[PDB]
Amino acid sequence: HHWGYGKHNGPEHWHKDFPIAKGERQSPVDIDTHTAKYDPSLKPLSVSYDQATSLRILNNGHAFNVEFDDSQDKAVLKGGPLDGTYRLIQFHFHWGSLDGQGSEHTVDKKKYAAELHLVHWNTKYGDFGKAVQQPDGLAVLGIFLKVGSAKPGLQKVVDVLDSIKTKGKSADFTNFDPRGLLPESLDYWTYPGSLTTPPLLECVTWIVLKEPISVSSEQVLKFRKLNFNGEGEPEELMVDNWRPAQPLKNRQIKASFK
Ligand SMILES: Cc1cccc(C(=O)NN)c1
Numbered sequence: 001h002h003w004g005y006g007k008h009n010g011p012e013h014w015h016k017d018f019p020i021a022k023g024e025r026q027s028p029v030d031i032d033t034h035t036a037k038y039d040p041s042l043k044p045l046s047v048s049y050d051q052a053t054s055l056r057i058l059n060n061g062h063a064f065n066v067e068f069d070d071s072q073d074k075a076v077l078k079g080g081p082l083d084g085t086y087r088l089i090q091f092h093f094h095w096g097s098l099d100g101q102g103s104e105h106t107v108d109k110k111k112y113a114a115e116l117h118l119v120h121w122n123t124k125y126g127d128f129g130k131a132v133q134q135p136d137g138l139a140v141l142g143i144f145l146k147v148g149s150a151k152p153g154l155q156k157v158v159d160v161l162d163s164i165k166t167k168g169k170s171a172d173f174t175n176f177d178p179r180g181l182l183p184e185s186l187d188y189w190t191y192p193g194s195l196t197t198p199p200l201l202e203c204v205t206w207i208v209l210k211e212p213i214s215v216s217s218e219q220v221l222k223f224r225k226l227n228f229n230g231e232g233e234p235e236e237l238m239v240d241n242w243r244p245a246q247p248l249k250n251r252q253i254k255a256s257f258k
């Protein structure tokens with residue numbers, strides 16, 4: 001037994017091994033655009049990725065992570081709702097078996113084909129492990145994907161997936177520029193939440209961009225050829241690796257735009 005996204009180990013089961021699954025600050029949520037409030041005190045998001053150093057891409061059995069060197073302030077998120085400096089450590093995606101589902105956050109109940117998560121940790125806590133013991137330890141930039149024209153800056157990711165088909169496989173993945181995954185606008189919604197995977201820790205300032213990026217059908221098709229399983233095990237396609245919306249409870253979603 002291990003947590004996953006199948007019928008017997010999927011999101012409705014996670015609370016048995018991770019009781020915080022039923023906590024007060026869980027993610028993702030539905031973003032109700034008519035309840036989120038414009039906050040004029042929010043600052044523009046500051047994305048400083050010019051010196052980003054990607055290292056490796058890893059199939060971890062539930063998604064693929066592109067990992068970055070976080071030993072210095074090489075790729076950081078500042079501003080927006082944040083106080084201080086958050087260092088990029090990895091990004092990954094969530095996607096569906098079909099174009100009509102795949103995102104974790106929803107917008108007025110709309111599900112996008114996929115969702116990108118760029119995970120950052122607050123440098124005042126020194127490392128990622130200590131950051132995930134804090135309520136302001138992490139900032140995750142979430143970006144929706146819709147199917148349309150291809151995303152050129154995603155193609156290098158797509159093209160290496162054949163080399164990390166199964167759980168535990170990794171490949172060198174240097175000189176990848178995450179700026180090629182951003183939309184034009186950096187307007188966003190923000191709310192306090194959690195990791196959307198076990199251990200579901202409630203450490204995240206979520207910053208979800210309003211504007212989706214467009215990726216081609218072929219690009220997301222290649223995501224769906226990955227495997228949850230390890231090599232030599234029965235093939236289980238890596239699809240529908242998203243957690244559904246959780247109760248908002250006593251939280252407010254703020255908008256950077258009106
Ligand atoms: C390890 C970590 C930290 C923050 C967010 C996530 C996530 O988006 N999981 N799907 C994962």
Ligand SMILES: [Zn+2]
Pocket residue numbers: 092093094117196
């Ligand atoms: Zn995620």
